[PDB]
Structure 1
C-alpha cells in the first residue's frame, strides 16, 4: 500500500485545479472543483449522485461535443468556471 498501490496514485502535481460546473437542461446544476489532470468522471458520477440522475440515461456535453467520463479538462481544454451541458437521452420528466 506504499510503492505498489499507494493511496496517492497520481504523480506529484502542483495545485492547478479548475472549477467545472455541470448544468443539465433538467434544471439540475452544480459546481465542482477538480484538478486540471483529474478525469471528469469524478464530477460526472458526483453530479448524478446529488442531483438524482442516471449516468446511462443522461449524457455530458461540452463545447458542442459530447464528452466521456474518461476525458480530462486538460484534453478538451476546459477552463475554470466554465459549464458542461447535460441532456437526457431518454425521458425523466
Structure 2
C-alpha cells in the first residue's frame, strides 16, 4: 500500500490460464519469487522468463528497485 512489508505481485504466464499471486519481500530480489512461482506449478528446473513493464527481470533486481507496489503485474514467457 504505502508502508508495505512485502508486495503482493500477480505473476501470470503467456497463457491467461497460467496464474499465480505471491508475496515478494521488498528487500528480497525477484529471483526468490521466480523460484517460488516455478515450484508452485512444478516447473522446478525448467525455468521460464519474467517481464515487468517490458523490462527483462534478470532476478538480481529488487521489487522496490523496479518501483513496484502491492497489486502489480509480473508476466511470464516460455
TM superposition score category, shorter chain reference: 0.7 to 0.9
Structure 1 length normalisation: TM-score?
Answer: 0.69
RMSD after superposition: 1.7
Relative contact order (C-alpha < 8 Å, sep 6+): which is higher?
Answer: 2
Q: Tell me the matched-pair count.
A: 73
Shift >6 Å, 4+ stretches: none
Greater Rg over alpha carbons, structure:
1
Residue deviations 1:58-85, cap 9 Å, x none? Answer: 2000011110211100111111111111
Structure 1: runs of 5 or more not aligned: 1-13, 89-93
- Could you say which structure has the higher helix fraction? 2
